[PDB]
Amino acid sequence: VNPTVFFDIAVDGEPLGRVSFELFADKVPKTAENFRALSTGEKGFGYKGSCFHRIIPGFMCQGGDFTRHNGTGGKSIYGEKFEDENFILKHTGPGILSMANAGPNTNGSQFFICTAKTEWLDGKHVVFGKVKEGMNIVEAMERFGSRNGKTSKKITIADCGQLE
């Protein structure tokens, strides 16, 4: 019953592939709903055309700034920020989808996908989903990151929406 959403990823115009995500609405319904709605654009704004602005190989890929496209922006469907819903789910391994933030209770639209177990983030970032299909695409995106996160090409959500 959990929603499934997809991103079609391109590297400066070159199609890379589709990543799909299960959103754990059963555990974090408010956080899952925000991501679902931003992925469909049904509130009038969202992730389509935004990039993965910070990519660190062996760690994670971060994106979701559709307001400024410079890594400082983003907003939720509830307002500029919303609470950390709960920390039941942990950063257990690759594929984990979690909220980026600037401190407690500052969730907006920015998110990241883990490419490794990142347990030191447990209790600080809200985990709310996981890659279902296309983990190979996320691994491919890593080659375009670097140790300090700066990307060598713009990794774009060319299209996105909801599958189930």
Residues that bind ligand 838 (CB under 6 A): 54, 56, 60, 62, 71-72, 100-102, 110, 112, 148-149
| Minimum distance from residue 102 beta carbon to ligand 838 (Å) | 4
Distance in Å, CB of 162 to ligand 838, minimum? 23
Nearest CA-CA partner of 72 in 55, 59, 57, 53? 53
Choose the catalytic residue: 6, 21, 111, 112. Answer: 112
Q: Which two tokens stand for residue 28?
A: 């974090």
Q: How many CB atoms lie within 10 A of CB 19?
A: 26
Strands (E), 51-151: 54-56, 60-63, 96-99, 111-114, 127-133
Closer CB to ligand 838, 64 or 134, in the complex: 64
Both tokens assigned to 48: 């389509």
121 labelled catalytic: yes
Place of tokens 């019953």: 1
129 DSSP β-pair partners: 23, 97
In the set 16, 121, 128, 144, the catalytic residue is: 121
CB of 84 to ligand 838, least distance (A): 12
Q: Which of 7, 24, 59, 82 is catalytic?
A: 59
Q: Catalytic: 91?
A: no
Rg, C-alpha atoms of the chain: 14
> Is 147 among the residues known to form the active site?
no
Residue nearest to ligand 838 (CB): 100
Active-site annotation holds for 125: yes
List, by residue number, the catalytic residues. Answer: 54, 59, 62, 101, 112, 121, 125
